[PDB]
């Protein structure tokens, strides 16, 4: 067997030329065709390059494939880089038995505008309280970049138990969304004066508060 | 146009079996080597198996040898993946792929989700997230639906049977320490439509055949 | 036997071997089927090249099967050809 | 003796 | 003998190797109403040479048809079983035979 | 072992026709492209015609286009060359050749002589060349046969129906100003065998369907 | 169409390396395989090299083929030259329609020893005399080099009428053979005391004489 090594992530500014390399561990690279796939969030992979440098119709002229037998590696070159090129890229090749994909490269396009998050906090519904359960829901949307910190308070006391937060993911508008859930018993909910969800993005903190009844 | 349509994915207990199908059209199926590739959520592509055009030669990743069987029916234009002795680590979206030669994939299907877990199917309980004074600023109100503790993925949420799309934000699900999923969907609406417009979230959890239409109104 | 009528099986860039498919309940009982020797094709230097594939050329043929008989359509590999992923 | 033959074959015979 | 018979219920559409082969071929209809079947698709090699790695016709090798002997029915009330030769497809042959 | 045996050669009048055959064995005939190559006496090799293994493609030298036809019978393992409108310039030894691919000849036949002339066939007059004291060299003696005035070439000479091969020297023919050929064949034998062993030269002239077996004895 | 140009002859000593070139007039030589044939006197051609450099079994290791793209020519190389290598050599190649042979090259192995002719003269047979004809047959063999002078005498008088002599031809042993015929009437044969065939080779003469009855 063999492996294919790709950089975990690459960041480049728009209009520049970006190269994603793919190094084969064992076996001669030049003996087997190299494919390159693009994968957008929640989508099937699409082919960008097949048979080392073949570009299918529909794929822009900006994308190109090449091989370097001395370094036992393949390269995907993207010229005139656009924000629409942000996606995951996988190289792929084979031997007479196996088929191997590289680990993938997350391609980031820099210079995109910063966006503050809209934060909304909901208290438990009457229906859920009646079922002897209580969930606080903190929704965070339309922020850029994707890094966000979420903290919860029971009155002024930090609370870590019962909190479940999603890793942020891109929306259809290319901005990020995330959510955080605080699970409590109806008794914990009713015994405090309030609960707060604090959201830190790019050094600024927004705090939302809800109170029983 | 090349079409690859996967079927057969679902929830199965460890040690269990499942058969995947891929119906192909738009090409002479018997003259193409076919492949299965899988992707666990938030992870990379992993090759599973390959079969020559005639079905005379089969190839397998080490992680699936002795447990999976690739086969094809050239009269029916269908590719199969018989998955025996399933384990938690086999959980992934399974893609059907057309190869120009062994190892040169040219087309991918849409995938079918396979969940291998000792947790059983659970339909969500749907709760309204009532618009209030705390979800109102600058003439807009936030209202939603909490889709709590379901298993497995996926869930689908619409508003007013699809007639309401503007201001809708359905969030990606959280995977809790319990192994259950939860998600929320919110809509931001003119605050003056509260008490005039009915807002209903339509929740569908096809794995447990759960369809819930929840009316969300201000609390009074 | 096809080896005695033609030797393309040994001279092809996608060479093949011939295997006897025996069936006493079928007419004819013996059918010689082509099986590609390699996955790749033999290149200009004599090596197996995996930038291409040896593939069987299959032909649909009518065969007799078992007082009562039925005419069945069967698929047989006559020989192998070399295919590439780049069509020029 | 019985010999099962397809429809297209019989039409050609008759 | 009493046969007492019972009646029961294009290669481009089944396979595209003809276009993808290094020894590509075309399919021609050989029509005969006094023969069963009436239409037989015969493979005819497109080129004398084979298509090389750069896409050119290479004359260091030859495209040759693979012919199969097949039994066919003919009218001669009376019929005769005739052995006919048909080209199924083409292969690429070279004058240098290697060992591997 | 590859064998290519040509037949059909002989004398033809200008404007005449002739068909050559080449019987092949020791290889799968139908999977080989075949060729005809000619050689005029004391001149170079000249390609005439080629035919693919199936017989589906034929190729011709400019000097023979329209007049010659190459064909093959794969059930009989025979290659043919039909020659029409023959001229003096077509006079040559015609070789049958096996090709590995078009233009790569691997094996040659023995050839068949074609003579295009308006001169008439003449069978040879065979005369003994008797050993005498003036032809002896001690333990050895030379005796022979004179093959006088024949047309066209070739003649073949053996001794004692092929049982005598050692010491045989058949000389190349002289082409006389008359257009007729003459040749001699000599054999050196032990001088002590002269009144004990019968020596016969076997002269074959296939162009006149003549065969002469001439007894050569000492003159007394 | 195209032509192939070969030297008319090449001469070298035994044990030396000899090269025979073959230049193609039009079309790229490297696009089509080059064959080389050996032809011995009165024999069918045999293959020495096929497919530019392939040597069949039975052909000595001494023979080798090569091609030169820049000069558009093929070469047949013979290392460790032997006397048995004397023969005619033809290169051959093709295009998508035609097959072309070169003009041929006569290979001469130099320094071969001078050999005297073996001469046998036969008088007319009784059978031929009875048919009112008379041929004197002078057979000349195993001489080297190939130049030979044949003269006839009627008693001591030179005779030129009625003589037919072959040009010398190469034997399987590299030496030469020739024959000379003297046509006479039975009356000319019987009226002289003798006839002679005189064979000169390298300044030395062998004279054979025959007499009627
Ligand atoms: C059996 N003996 C002793 C033979 O000497 C038969 C052959 C040699 C042999 O043993 N060869 C094995 C391999 C083999 C076996 C069977 C077929 N099939 C057909 O010939 C059939 C006719 C037929 C034969 C038998 C039963 C039903 C039947 F309907 N026809 C077509 O296929 C057909 C018509 C049009 N297009 N096609 C494609 C061909 C190839 C075989 C044909 C040449 C001689």
Short mmCIF file of N, CA and C in Angstrom, two decimals, chain B residues 28 30-32 53 99-100, chain E residues 12-17 20:
data_model
loop_
_atom_site.label_atom_id
_atom_site.label_comp_id
_atom_site.label_asym_id
_atom_site.label_seq_id
_atom_site.Cartn_x
_atom_site.Cartn_y
_atom_site.Cartn_z
N UNK B 28 -22.84 3.49 -21.21
CA UNK B 28 -22.81 2.03 -21.39
C UNK B 28 -22.14 1.43 -20.14
N UNK B 30 -21.75 -1.54 -18.60
CA UNK B 30 -20.87 -2.72 -18.62
C UNK B 30 -19.45 -2.44 -19.13
N UNK B 31 -19.22 -1.30 -19.80
CA UNK B 31 -17.88 -1.01 -20.26
C UNK B 31 -17.12 -0.08 -19.29
N UNK B 32 -17.61 0.08 -18.03
CA UNK B 32 -16.97 0.93 -17.03
C UNK B 32 -16.70 0.24 -15.70
N UNK B 53 -15.45 -3.59 -15.37
CA UNK B 53 -16.67 -3.51 -16.19
C UNK B 53 -17.45 -4.82 -16.28
N UNK B 99 -15.46 4.93 -13.08
CA UNK B 99 -14.04 5.00 -13.40
C UNK B 99 -13.76 4.81 -14.89
N UNK B 100 -12.93 5.67 -15.49
CA UNK B 100 -12.57 5.57 -16.92
C UNK B 100 -11.65 4.37 -17.17
N UNK E 12 -23.22 -0.29 -29.86
CA UNK E 12 -22.84 1.07 -29.40
C UNK E 12 -23.55 1.45 -28.10
N UNK E 13 -24.78 0.93 -27.91
CA UNK E 13 -25.67 1.18 -26.77
C UNK E 13 -25.37 0.29 -25.56
N UNK E 14 -24.73 -0.86 -25.79
CA UNK E 14 -24.32 -1.81 -24.75
C UNK E 14 -22.88 -1.55 -24.29
N UNK E 15 -21.98 -1.17 -25.23
CA UNK E 15 -20.56 -0.91 -24.94
C UNK E 15 -19.97 0.22 -25.79
N UNK E 16 -19.08 1.00 -25.20
CA UNK E 16 -18.42 2.10 -25.89
C UNK E 16 -16.89 1.91 -26.01
N UNK E 17 -16.39 0.65 -25.79
CA UNK E 17 -14.96 0.31 -25.95
C UNK E 17 -14.45 0.65 -27.36
N UNK E 20 -13.08 4.02 -27.13
CA UNK E 20 -12.08 4.21 -26.08
C UNK E 20 -10.80 3.38 -26.26
#
